[PDB]
Amino acid sequence: EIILTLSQGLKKYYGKILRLLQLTLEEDTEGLLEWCKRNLGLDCDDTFFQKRIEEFFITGEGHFNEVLQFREPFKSYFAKGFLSIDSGYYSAKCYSGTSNSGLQLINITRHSTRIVDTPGPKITNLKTINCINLKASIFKEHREVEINVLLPQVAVNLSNCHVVIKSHVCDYSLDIDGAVRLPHIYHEGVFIPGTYKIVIDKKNKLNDRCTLFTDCVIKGREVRKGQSVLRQYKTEIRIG
Ligand SMILES: *[C@@H]1O[C@H](CO)[C@@H](O[C@@H]2O[C@H](CO)[C@@H](O)[C@H](O)[C@H]2NC(C)=O)[C@H](O)[C@H]1NC(C)=O
Ligand SMILES: *[C@@H]1O[C@H](CO)[C@@H](O[C@@H]2O[C@H](CO)[C@@H](O)[C@H](O)[C@H]2NC(C)=O)[C@H](O)[C@H]1NC(C)=O
């Protein structure tokens, strides 16, 4: 019978958080339950973790310890606003609900009807983005670009990109193709960040061919009845 050390089980504890946040698809949790009984006197089950996540991001209000509890190895707690949720295999710098001005998550359990599709150019220039769901800022003196995503419920897919996601929920690196993963928090429904920032460094020649695929959302007023309308088309935005 092999038991985890304090730091070993903590990484797996964070590994479980990352998996539940949906920032990772893999975990190592062999030995985590015994490590919670011994070091926390608790059952480390899925219910426990979703409330740790719920409290840390939305609901908790005092100071928190490294294991995301609010007011033995972890009876000490932090005044600063973040924990480094670091499993060893992956890490994310996550800010507590306490540290922000209000709530910077949005509820995506809500129904909204599908933004109707309407034709548009397959390739969109980075410097003339007409979609409302993201906004680009270019820093030629640092040869960096930042893409602000204003509608995170609308997918942004990365291809051959190597970026840093910045947001008021968590900050983390992404290194693989596909839809940008975001922290998912359950609180009478599923919440994701209300806005996030994709930071792309051109000094790193490894994203020489970084390109973004997204649903370009167009906001309009239909002239006949005077009401606001939303439409979308698939488009690619090339960087570098
Ligand atoms: C997140 O959105 C969901 C879905 O809109 C909310 O869940 C519903 O909440 C209402 C009350 O506001 C209940 O009457 C419904 O039964 C719930 N479920 C469904 C399927 O509609 C949820 O309350 C929202 N969460 C927050 C924190 O506002
Ligand atoms: C970004 O990637 C996601 C999947 O990672 C794409 O969503 C798929 O869209 C097709 C057609 O709409 C569906 O048949 C699949 O079931 C979807 N997959 C998932 C997991 O939802 C999305 O279309 C991609 N975006 C762009 C602009 O290409």
Residue numbers in the entry: 252 to 322, 341 to 509
Quote from the publication:
Crimean-Congo hemorrhagic fever virus (CCHFV) is the causative agent of the most widespread tick-borne viral infection in humans. CCHFV encodes a secreted glycoprotein (GP38) of unknown function that is the target of a protective antibody. Nairoviruses are the only bunyaviruses that are known to encode secreted glycoproteins, such as the 38-kDa glycoprotein (GP38) that is produced by CCHFV. GP38 (GPC residues 248 to 519) does not share substantial sequence homology with other viral or cellular proteins. It is N-glycosylated in the endoplasmic reticulum (ER) and cleaved by subtilisin kexin isozyme-1/site-1 protease (SKI-1/S1P) in the Golgi complex to liberate it from Gn.
We expressed a construct containing GPC residues 1 to 515 of CCHFV strain IbAr 10200 in FreeStyle 293 cells. Crystals of GP38 grew in 0.1 M sodium acetate (pH 5.5), 2% to 4% polyethylene glycol 400 (PEG 400), and 11% to 21% PEG 3350 and belonged to the P21 space group. Because GP38 lacks sequence homology to known structures, we collected multiple long-wavelength data sets on the beamline I23 at Diamond Light Source to obtain experimental phases via sulfur single-wavelength anomalous dispersion (SAD). The structure of GP38 was initially determined to 2.8 Å using these data sets, and was subsequently extended to 2.5-Å resolution with an additional data set collected at Advanced Photon Source. There are two molecules of CCHFV GP38 in the asymmetric unit, denoted chain A and chain B. Chain A has electron density for GPC residues 252 to 322 and 341 to 509, whereas chain B has electron density for GPC residues 250 to 327, 342 to 379, 387 to 486, and 499 to 514. The overall structure of GP38 is defined by a 3-helix bundle at the N terminus followed by a β-sandwich comprising 7- and 4-strand β-sheets. In addition to the β-sandwich, the β-strand-rich core of GP38 also contains a pair of small antiparallel β-strands. The region between residues 328 and 340 is disordered, suggesting that this loop is flexible. The CCHFV GP38 fold is stabilized by four disulfide bonds between Cys287 and Cys295, Cys363 and Cys439, Cys400 and Cys485, and Cys430 and Cys479. The CCHFV GP38 sequence contains N-linked glycosylation sequons at Asn376 and Asn426, and both of these sites showed well-resolved electron density for glycans extending away from the protein surface. No higher order oligomerization was detected from the crystallographic packing, consistent with the SEC data that GP38 is a monomer.
